[PDB]
Amino acid sequence: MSVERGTSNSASYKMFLTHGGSPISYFHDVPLFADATNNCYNMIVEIPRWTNAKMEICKEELMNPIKHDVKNNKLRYIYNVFPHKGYIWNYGALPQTWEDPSYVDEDTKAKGDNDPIDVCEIGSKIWPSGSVIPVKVLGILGMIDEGETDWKVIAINVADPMAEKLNDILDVDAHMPGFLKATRDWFKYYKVPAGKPENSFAFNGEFKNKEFAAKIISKTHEHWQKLISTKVEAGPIIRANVTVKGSPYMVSKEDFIDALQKHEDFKRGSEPTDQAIEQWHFC
Amino acid sequence: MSVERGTSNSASYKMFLTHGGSPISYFHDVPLFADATNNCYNMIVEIPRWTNAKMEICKEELMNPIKHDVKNNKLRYIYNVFPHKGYIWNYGALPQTWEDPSYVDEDTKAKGDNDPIDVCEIGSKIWPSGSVIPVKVLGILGMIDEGETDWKVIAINVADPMAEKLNDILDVDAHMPGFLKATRDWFKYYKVPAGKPENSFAFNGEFKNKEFAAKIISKTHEHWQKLISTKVEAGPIIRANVTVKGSPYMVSKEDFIDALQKHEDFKRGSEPTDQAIEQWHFCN
Ligand SMILES: [Co+2]
Numbered sequence: 001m002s003v004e005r006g007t008s009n010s011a012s013y014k015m016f017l018t019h020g021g022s023p024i025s026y027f028h029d030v031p032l033f034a035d036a037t038n039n040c041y042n043m044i045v046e047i048p049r050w051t052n053a054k055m056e057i058c059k060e061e062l063m064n065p066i067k068h069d070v071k072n073n074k075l076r077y078i079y080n081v082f083p084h085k086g087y088i089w090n091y092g093a094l095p096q097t098w099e100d101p102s103y104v105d106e107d108t109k110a111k112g113d114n115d116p117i118d119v120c121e122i123g124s125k126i127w128p129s130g131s132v133i134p135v136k137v138l139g140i141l142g143m144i145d146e147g148e149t150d151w152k153v154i155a156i157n158v159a160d161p162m163a164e165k166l167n168d169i170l171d172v173d174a175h176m177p178g179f180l181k182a183t184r185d186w187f188k189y190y191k192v193p194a195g196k197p198e199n200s201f202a203f204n205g206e207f208k209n210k211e212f213a214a215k216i217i218s219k220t221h222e223h224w225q226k227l228i229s230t231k232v233e234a235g236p237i238i239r240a241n242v243t244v245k246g247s248p249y250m251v252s253k254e255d256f257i258d259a260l261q262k263h264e265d266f267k268r269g270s271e272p273t274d275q276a277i278e279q280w281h282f283c
Numbered sequence: 284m285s286v287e288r289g290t291s292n293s294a295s296y297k298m299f300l301t302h303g304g305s306p307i308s309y310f311h312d313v314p315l316f317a318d319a320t321n322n323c324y325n326m327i328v329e330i331p332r333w334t335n336a337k338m339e340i341c342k343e344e345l346m347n348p349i350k351h352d353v354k355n356n357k358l359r360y361i362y363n364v365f366p367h368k369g370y371i372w373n374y375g376a377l378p379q380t381w382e383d384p385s386y387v388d389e390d391t392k393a394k395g396d397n398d399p400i401d402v403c404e405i406g407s408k409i410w411p412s413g414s415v416i417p418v419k420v421l422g423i424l425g426m427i428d429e430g431e432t433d434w435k436v437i438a439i440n441v442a443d444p445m446a447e448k449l450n451d452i453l454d455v456d457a458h459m460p461g462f463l464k465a466t467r468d469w470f471k472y473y474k475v476p477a478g479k480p481e482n483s484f485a486f487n488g489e490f491k492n493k494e495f496a497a498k499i500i501s502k503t504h505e506h507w508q509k510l511i512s513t514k515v516e517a518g519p520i521i522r523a524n525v526t527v528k529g530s531p532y533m534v535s536k537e538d539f540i541d542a543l544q545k546h547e548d549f550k551r552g553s554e555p556t557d558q559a560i561e562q563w564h565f566c567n
Pocket residue numbers: 056115
């Protein structure tokens with residue numbers, strides 16, 4: 001169960017995860033694997049398909065709620081780059097992973113974007129923000145965002161009917177012609193209508209298969225494990241707090257169990273809508 | 284002002300147009316020109332951009348309300364055909380026009396689809412169903428929809444900031460690269476997930492400029508003028524009815540306001556849908 005606080009469509013909006021009416025961290029307290037190494041991962045859905053609001057798990061706040069990303073001091077909405085409407089997958093991230101910013105990847109030759117590893121979920125169901133769902137990984141794209149390592153995992157909700165026919169990245173291309181290309185294009189151009197340069201990619205933009213994913217994911221999990229393990233070491237501004245026992249059990253940054261500070265601002269529905277939710281950009 | 288009755292997301296949903304608390308016909312009573320042969324047309328918006336529900340003016344019901352299309356005894360929803368999400372324009376129609384089903388067009392060599400002429404409005408704003416919008420025409424696509432003439436006007440809302448950097452169809456291609464092709468693709472494949480064939484096109488798919496467009500529109504207007512022109516001829520099923528106390532000239536099908544007298548159902552809010560409002564279908 002997830003719960004909401006503050007006023008929606010504003011900076012004061014926060015969404016926390018709970019278990020048993022008791023808050024846990026989206027970042028740290030959700031296991032990376034839903035089911036063993038039977039290649040079933042937990043995905044945190046930040047952004048529903050065909051939506052424009054850039055929701056993110058917040059690293060800088062206690063319990064790591066999902067909140068609106070902000071730019072300029074305004075709520076951030078991504079652009080519609082023709083022919084796409086908003087995010088064209090359910091977009092989010094794998095818990096207990098970290099794109100380490102002091103670590104250079106030999107294949108992107110860049111450092112990490114300081115956030116959990118990103119996921120694009122491609123099932124037909126539109127998942128609401130804050131959902132936690134089990135996914136099979138199919139492959140991965142080596143995005144170099146604004147000069148930072150920004151791997152994008154390709155995955156599908158394991159209860160989707162296509163999950164059976166889709167076992168590796170090649171299957172995706174056979175059943176979804178044009179989909180992989182549109183996906184590269186999306187990440188390539190999506191900041192151009194903000195005046196930002198085109199993004200680039202590792203391996204000349206080649207989607208790598210599910211075996212090369214898993215390995216990359218496991219690496220980001222090790223970094224997360226190091227960030228949490230102990231490393232009693234200031235990784236500026238990320239709050240590493242985590243709860244119950246175990247969860248994570250070894251961590252120095254553990255505590256138990258907050259509850260009290262989960263008292264921020266009772267929720268309130270609000271004035272919706274603002275920016276370029278509506279406009280088409282041609283890039 | 285538009286006014287609603289019946290239960291939404293159901294077959295009993297009906298949206299009527301009124302002026303001054305008095306209903307008028309979406310089909311017959313909204314003038315085709317918002318501003319004479321000063322370049323400007325009225326468009327009835329049936330379908331907001333990026334929605335899937337197929338709303339349309341009802342032709343067979345008094346006052347011609349907008350309602351859900353229905354096939355196989357359930358509400359009709361359009362497929363998402365990759366990479367598009369529902370309708371990729373505000374979709375609708377020009378009032379007082381008619382693709383005459385007894386009329387064969389020299390360029391499509393086919394008869395009309397018995398509906399008013401269709402419009403794709405391409406401005407930024409997403410318009411709710413039932414809106415009536417002043418638009419400038421930029422071009423036309425000669426679509427043959429399952430064998431019926433089904434011209435699709437390309438137009439833009441005159442208050443959109445693009446409204447004229449865009450003066451003709453060639454300007455659309457310049458500022459919106461890919462848009463025209465994606466638009467023909469949409470109409471080509473949109474019934475393929477239903478098992479139906481690909482649609483085809485007049486002039487091998489060519490978008491014709493606005494001068495050609497306005498010519499076709501006039502023709503569809505002259506047909507509507509014949510349908511309504513007191514023409515005492517039973518091509519109904521279509522209700523040619525008009526109003527008001529000074530609306531459609533001296534159409535035989537005008538009346539007083541028996542239209543107000545039609546009280547029905549009263550509005551009601553209802554459960555959402557499910558089907559494949561969500562699903563992606565893939566056809567090149
Ligand atoms: Co970020």
